[PDB]
Design a protein around this ligand. Structure first.
Ligand SMILES: [C][C]N([C][C])C1=[C][C]=C(C2=N[N]C(=O)[C][C]2[C])[C]=C1N([O])=O
Ligand SMILES: [C][C]N([C][C])C1=[C][C]=C(C2=N[N]C(=O)[C][C]2[C])[C]=C1N([O])=O
Ligand SMILES: [Mg+2]
Ligand SMILES: [Mg+2]
Ligand SMILES: [Mn+2]
Ligand SMILES: [Mn+2]
Lengths: 365, 363
């Protein structure tokens, strides 16, 4: 049972691709090809680099062996399925790191907590890492790594409709997300070889665990409109986001992991088209099982009647679009001032270009 | 491998106690003595009587063997602990049946079932069973029977503080209540011998399961103040409770199971004192394990320094009192026109509260 990290913990021949981590369109499929498909090390190698970039090993006296042991066991428990795999976990962790470390035009630093900064971070700009304490940031990064742990390649709706043992176990409520959090935490506690949090006190550890669970459970898209309405409520109230309020910080971390989780349509066309391929291939596996069980095939999941452009157009218009508008309205989107100044925002620019590409595909069909 | 209901499905020797089900202070400990203390049939025998009283077997074409098979398997998986046992499950089912079937002064009433006990044909009474469709009522009754299934005799706080497997499995959220619902439903789906819902269509069955889970999860007292504030909100808004609104009906069913679950302090002194003895004895078992694990003993859980009166006074003042006041303000409390209203349930709660305050005054 004690899966341990490969002998040379840090792989070391990957420097030329790893130095591109500080870009939004990090070429993650070129990293996969450089490491080796199913070498099972992409998540632990990127986790190492981003924890070191933030000085999180010093801040919490994290021993590197136990940390690499855990992140390797975690990445090994992600299945070989087309989308909800360790490559997606790596992508989401990169996205949360990018959203929390990169310059945000006109964001104020909380006047007055222990805070970490990226080595990449060097009046007119702030970053979330300057407003969210190191403990809470580390919880968000670990949540991103564990968020899809042991994903079966089926939706909550499918597990509930088929009375899958997991759906009965979790009373049909956030079935996958409860399982990811519970299975990742059970893995963590199963062996002292995994205990990278040994230097947190008991109060800190219980708070850390609470924050990780809240972040993973926030990735259930059945709650998507509830989180977005709650967040628009906090932004448009008397004081706006209050960075000294622990519940306001939690809600920002949850919006951050939610955006990170569905970042694909807001990447360059090349990345977005590869992730689109991944999710529709996982849907077709589900559509095949639905047919074999005599259920009707869910919309967009029938390989012999694809509606790929309709899926991505409506995903962008109903889910990704409103989440980005809400996050941008809070003033939390990384961007650059244009030389009542305007902001150039790469993330919304990509989402707009991808939306237009899918509408153009629809108008031909 | 399947637990099956005992030889003659219905015990014939219980008639003189079973006819007293239509009283608030049902002598449940006399029923225990008449059956035998761990005979393990009390929940299935009472469930049969209350389902037959409401004509629920005819309304959903329930096969009685599968129904008795399931309720016997369920009652067997309640542990021999002092409070959260099959006797408590029986008590809560009786209380939800009583609150939903018995006359309510000035309640308006319209796929509905009615108790054979419901006589009193004065215009000026209704019952909730006249306002809550039979499918939703049956969900509330089955939830009451399953609400504490496989209870370990420990609080959520103890399971979370000790990183018990169940607390890890449920991410520290409503750990016991998720387990009761999940373990009860797993038992149901485990055997065709248990499928008493076979004549519900697929839409009905999915709705039924949703309602049962919502009712069991509502018994977590971490949510108590949220439910009470939400209910007072719906009662004091422009239209009040709207019986044609499915979310208003669910919230009434959840207030009903919540009151049924903590009914003890609103029973006659004799019943209330036996239930109080049960809960403090279960707490002491928890305090013993806390000491052995080197944890500080939780408040009220120390056998060598009991604080029974302080426990019950503050439980009634903080939890039971405000829930009864809120349910009574909605006009949903069973009672009799004297015209003012005599309400047995609130009169018992007031008398038991005064009894504990008087005990404290000596200590
Ligand atoms: C129903 C939402 N959903 C299932 C979990 C989903 C997940 C991810 C993506 C997805 N689409 N485009 C990408 O670039 C990659 C991911 C974010 C799309 C959907 N969807 O059903 O539409
Ligand atoms: C606070 C909730 N609780 C422990 C889970 C509890 C349950 C039942 C009773 C109990 N009190 N009085 C009775 O008559 C029987 C039951 C409801 C009391 C408590 N409590 O901690 O106060
Ligand atoms: Mg997920
Ligand atoms: Mg309970
Ligand atoms: Mn994900
Ligand atoms: Mn109970």
């Amino acid at each position: 049972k004690p899966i341990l990290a490969p002998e040379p913990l840090v792989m070391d021949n990957l420097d030329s691709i790893m130095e591109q981590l500080n870009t939004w369109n990090f070429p993650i499929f070129d990293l996969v090809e450089n490491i080796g498909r199913k070498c099972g090390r992409i998540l632990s190698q990127v986790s190492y680099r981003l924890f070191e970039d933030m000085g999180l090993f010093e801040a919490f006296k994290i021993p590197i062996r136990e940390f690499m042991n855990y992140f390797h066991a975690l990445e090994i428990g992600y299945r070989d399925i087309p989308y909800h795999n360790r490559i997606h976990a790596t992508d989401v962790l990169h996205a949360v790191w990018y959203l929390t470390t990169q310059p945000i035009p006109g964001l104020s630093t909380v006047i007055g907590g222990s805070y970490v900064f990226s080595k990449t971070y060097n009046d007119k700009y702030g970053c979330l890492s300057g407003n969210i304490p190191a403990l809470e940031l580390m919880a968000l990064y670990v949540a991103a790594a564990m968020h899809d742990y042991d994903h079966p390649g089926r939706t909550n709706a499918f597990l509930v409709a088929t009375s899958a043992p997991q759906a009965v176990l979790y009373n049909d409520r956030s079935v996958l997300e409860n399982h990811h959090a519970a299975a990742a935490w059970n893995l963590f506690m199963s062996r002292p070889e995994y205990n990278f949090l040994i230097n947190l006190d008991h109060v800190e550890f219980k708070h850390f665990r609470f924050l990780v669970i809240e972040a993973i459970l926030a990735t259930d898209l059945k709650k998507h409109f509830d989180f977005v309405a709650k967040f628009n409520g906090k932004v448009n109230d008397d004081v706006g986001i209050d960075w000294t309020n622990e519940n306001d910080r939690l809600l920002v971390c949850q919006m951050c992991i939610k955006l990170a989780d569905i970042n694909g349509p807001a990447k360059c066309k090349e990345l977005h088209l590869q992730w689109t391929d991944g999710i529709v291939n996982e849907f077709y596996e589900q559509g095949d099982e639905e047919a074999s069980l005599g259920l009707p095939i869910s919309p967009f999941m029938d390989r012999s009647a694809p509606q790929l452009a309709n899926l991505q157009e409506s995903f962008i218009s109903h889910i990704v679009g409103p989440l980005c508008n809400s996050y941008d309205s809070a003033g939390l989107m990384p961007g650059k001032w244009v030389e009542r100044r305007k902001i150039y925002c790469q993330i919304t620019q990509h989402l707009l270009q991808n939306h237009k590409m899918w509408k153009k595909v629809i108008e031909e069909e």
